[PDB]
Amino acid sequence: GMASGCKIGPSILNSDLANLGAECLRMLDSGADYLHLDVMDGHFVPNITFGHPVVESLRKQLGQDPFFDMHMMVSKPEQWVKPMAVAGANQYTFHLEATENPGALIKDIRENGMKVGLAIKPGTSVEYLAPWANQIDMALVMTVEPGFGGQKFMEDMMPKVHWLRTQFPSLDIEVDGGVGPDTVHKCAEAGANMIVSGSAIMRSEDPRSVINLLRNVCSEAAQKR
Amino acid sequence: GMASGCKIGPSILNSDLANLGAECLRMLDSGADYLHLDVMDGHFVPNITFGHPVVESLRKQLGQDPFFDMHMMVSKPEQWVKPMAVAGANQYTFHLEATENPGALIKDIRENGMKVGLAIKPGTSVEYLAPWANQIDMALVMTVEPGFGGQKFMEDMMPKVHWLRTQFPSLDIEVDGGVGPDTVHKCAEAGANMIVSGSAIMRSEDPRSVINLLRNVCSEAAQKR
Ligand SMILES: [Zn+2]
Ligand SMILES: [Zn+2]
């Protein structure tokens, strides 16, 4: 199959947001494959993080090479496609629950020169990604309810990851929510190959070591597939 | 009267948002009286800037002394009072157009230990501020339409500032929108004593010089009142 082999994308929300450029560089210097940037508009989820203006500053600072995956937890994803492309995002991961026209939105993301991610919240059945799997670059199975503080990793989401992996062997599948050295085993064995992790990396004196561990656990499961 | 002296609060949206702490420290080291932080939720205005998690990082870096004025351009300002108070905001400036119960919000802001600001956009008659002028710490008369890039300063907003100053000699009155060395005379003469400016200060080589100029022009007007 053509699934990408394991990628680790640190989430930066638990980083020092007052020094976000330096934090990102630290993640990339520790071996991050991509940067997972969580954008929340206070409507789709009960929190407000940052929008395309922060993204543009980050792009000016880091240059063109680093890959930015925008996790768009916003209620009108159609509205931010162009501003994010102009800001320099590489991938636009929108929520199935935030539009009535996913098809048109996928076309617009592509028309704007970005890769397409499609995410689903815990209550949304995995079956609803099926008609879109072959038309996207990456699927995101969330493993916490977004926008809430201090949510435990949800083991009962793994059947969604396994079902996606079984039906679409070449789809890139991301997990996002409480993923760390302990929960990554379950995510990898279930089929996920794109790992988002935040506090487990940000709490460490040695983020390179934590990213290595995540990638290595992910790989050992992927080589068995 | 008890109108505060002249105060300059740089706006930081044209700063390097990937180095926001360093940018705020530079403003403070340049004589800024406060920091004016524009919060936009992508609904009340067509832009998403940043929320309380970024304010919390800023407060942790800069310590307890600097004063943060939150310009809350959000559709549900009731929702972010407690989160902003916990993040360490000093003043919460909400928009009169963003609520049908300004009275209860003013109380809630004060219960959460913050100063109270009340803002009106250009299309909103200044008469609508009057019932609340004595009950707030600061009124904000916006001098551009919020949410759009590169808007010209609106000279036709000056009569709103003057009416406010005449009716409420002890009220602190803020102007926000394309205010700089070339428009500050008009704002001061009209009656404004809190001056928010962006690029004119941010992109200067001598930001202390620009802050001093803005305060000095403002004082020359204030002395004649
Ligand atoms: Zn995310
Ligand atoms: Zn403002």
Swiss-Prot record, chains A, B:
Alphabetized Gene3D superfamilies for the sequence: Aldolase class I
A Pfam family reported for this protein in Swiss-Prot or TrEMBL: Ribul_P_3_epim
Domain of life, per lineage: Eukaryota
A molecular-function term among this protein's GO annotations: D-ribulose-phosphate 3-epimerase activity
Residues with PTM N-acetylalanine: 3
InterPro entries: Aldolase_TIM (IPR013785), Ribul_P_3_epim (IPR026019), Ribul_P_3_epim-like (IPR000056), RibuloseP-bd_barrel (IPR011060)
Enzyme Commission number: 5.1.3.1
Effect of substituting residue 11 to A: Nearly abolishes enzyme activity
Residues at which a divalent metal cation binds: 36, 38, 71, 176
Pathway per the UniProt entry: Carbohydrate degradation
Reactions catalysed: D-ribulose 5-phosphate = D-xylulose 5-phosphate
Claim: Cytoplasm is one of the keywords in the record: no
GO CC aspect terms: cytosol; extracellular exosome
Active site residues according to the UniProt entry: 38, 176
Effect of residue 40 to A: Lowers enzyme activity by 10%
Co-factor remark: Binds 1 divalent metal cation per subunit. Active with Fe(2+), and probably also with Mn(2+), Zn(2+) and Co(2+).
Effect the entry attributes to changing residue 71 to A: Alters protein structure
Keywords from the UniProt entry: Acetylation, Carbohydrate metabolism, Cobalt, Iron, Isomerase, Manganese, Metal-binding, Zinc
Family classification: Belongs to the ribulose-phosphate 3-epimerase family.
Subunit text: Homodimer.
Function: Catalyzes the reversible epimerization of D-ribulose 5-phosphate to D-xylulose 5-phosphate.
Protein name: Ribulose-phosphate 3-epimerase
Lineage: Eukaryota, Metazoa, Chordata, Craniata, Vertebrata
